[PDB]
Symmetry: none
Subunit: 121 residues, 2 copies
């Protein structure tokens, strides 16, 4: 859920999930259309597609456990849905951290009309 995902985000980036990655570009939030605007926005698009491969699961309400071992995120052994959702969240949070150098305020509260079309995954 956003409780776990928001915690990895804060731990990895020093930023709060809402608002820093909930109103950013075309895909960081609940938007789902258009061409990702930059590297951070691409991390989000990938995260949506990741959740997309899990139609038997519900990421929004599915809570999992993770721990930090040797400085890295470990998704603890759980249900297939818990494991796969944790892995999607871990990947996006590290993606965010890796792209912090190009994170820009320019793309916060980004207008709907500048995001057009479907990119299927």
């Amino acid at each position: 859920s956003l409780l776990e995902f928001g915690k990895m985000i804060l731990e990895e980036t020093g930023k709060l999930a809402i608002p820093s990655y909930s109103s950013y570009g075309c895909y960081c939030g609940w938007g789902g259309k258009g061409t990702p605007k930059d590297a951070t926005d691409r991390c989000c698009f990938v995260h949506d597609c990741c959740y997309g491969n899990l139609p038997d699961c519900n990421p929004k309400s599915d809570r999992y456990k993770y721990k930090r071992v040797n400085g890295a995120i470990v998704c603890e052994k759980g249900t297939s849905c818990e494991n796969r959702i944790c892995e999607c969240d871990k990947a996006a949070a590290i993606c965010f951290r890796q792209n912090l150098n190009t994170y820009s305020k320019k793309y916060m509260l980004y207008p709907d009309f500048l995001c057009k079309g479907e990119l299927k995954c």
Copy 2:
């Protein structure tokens, strides 16, 4: 599109394309620089080169059909673009499978900053 390619990748490798191949090495990802890390990363490099030679097309977004006949992927007859996109995808997905033997978890989540230099197609 990513949807059809992801599906071939799962079928050929038994791995879900996102996240196993979506942050892998220097080329299985959005980027395009440096020496490919290994055989798997080379499949991605070749796949970019293949898409790079389809400028009359929209590889990422355009949908196509394919079948399985006696084990093997068979691209169905669509538009010129569709069949070519399909063949690029089929070659990469088979490449991933052929090199599963040397797939290495240490190249997942690979930072793009460790990838420098243009390597010509």
